[PDB]
Structure 1
């Protein structure tokens, strides 16, 4: 076929690879960033829910 097919198709190949390449670099940075700070959706290590607290009055006033 014409060189145009190879030229345009290779440009699409480059565009896909460039977008993928920059995303992986963003992946490493974000994963490092939100692992440390933690104000992000993943890496949220489990805690204990406040629902499992008995708020009813106890047998002793000081509680």
Structure 2
């Protein structure tokens, strides 16, 4: 086919690999920041549920 086909294919391959490397580094930094301070969707450790707290009036008023 000629040298231009291999040239442009190499450029496309390099762009794909560079974007993948950038995204991998971004993923590492995002995971580290989330686990350091959990504020995104990931590393959300559980907590006792609100929906099983009895809010009805008790036998004792001081509750």
Structure 1 length as normaliser, TM-score? 0.96
Number of paired residues?
63
Residue in 1 that maps onto 2:49 = 49
Deviation at 1:49, TM superposition (A): 1.4
Deviations 1:1-36 (A, max 9, x none): 200000000000000000000000001100000111
| TM-score (norm: length of structure 2) | 0.96
RMSD over aligned CA atoms reads: 0.6
Unmatched 5+ residue regions in structure 1?
none
Q: Which runs of 5+ in 2 are unaligned?
A: none
- 4+ runs deviating over 4 angstroms: none
